[PDB]
């Protein structure tokens, strides 16, 4: 059974996965103010 340390590694992996999920074009567009051109 995972030790406290292995749990913390497992937790970082989960947190890191949530921060590296693919974004819709709709989500992405919502992030930005006016005056920018998509290349």
């Amino acid at each position: 059974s995972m030790t406290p340390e292995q749990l913390q590694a497992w937790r970082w992996e989960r947190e890191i996965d949530e921060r590296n999920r693919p974004l819709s074009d709709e989500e992405l567009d919502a992030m930005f103010p006016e005056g920018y051109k998509v290349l």
Binding site: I16, L23, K37
Partner: protein
């Protein structure tokens, strides 16, 4: 990696005449680029948003490109911050934009650290 790390990088002190290919050469060196938005108004020119597909590439670009020399000019490379991003709105309309983003997508709406 610290909470402020983000796949969206906000760039300042960007030359006005830099091309789409130059932008992809500079930033693409660090990993697959999701998209790039270049400022093209009086208030936004000289600035850009650079999005990575992967967060560890974005971290790597920050570590390496802050103060990067392109055409006698040193880039400022910062992690996206939604508060910052919507500065140029008025009190009431900003608060609603940030509310929308936190509610619909769960992004942090606090000012930088």
């Amino acid at each position: 990696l610290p909470p402020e790390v983000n796949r969206i990088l906000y760039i300042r002190n960007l030359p006005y005449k830099i091309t789409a290919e130059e932008m992809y050469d500079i930033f693409g060196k660090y990993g697959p680029i999701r998209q790039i938005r270049v400022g093209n108004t009086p208030e936004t020119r000289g600035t850009a948003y650079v999005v990575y597909e992967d967060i560890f590439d974005a971290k790597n670009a920050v570590d390496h490109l802050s103060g990067f020399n392109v055409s006698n000019r040193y880039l400022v490379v910062l992690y996206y911050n939604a508060n910052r991003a919507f500065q140029k709105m008025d009190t009431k309309k900003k608060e609603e934009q940030l509310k929308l983003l936190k509610e619909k997508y769960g992004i942090n709406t606090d000012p930088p650290k």
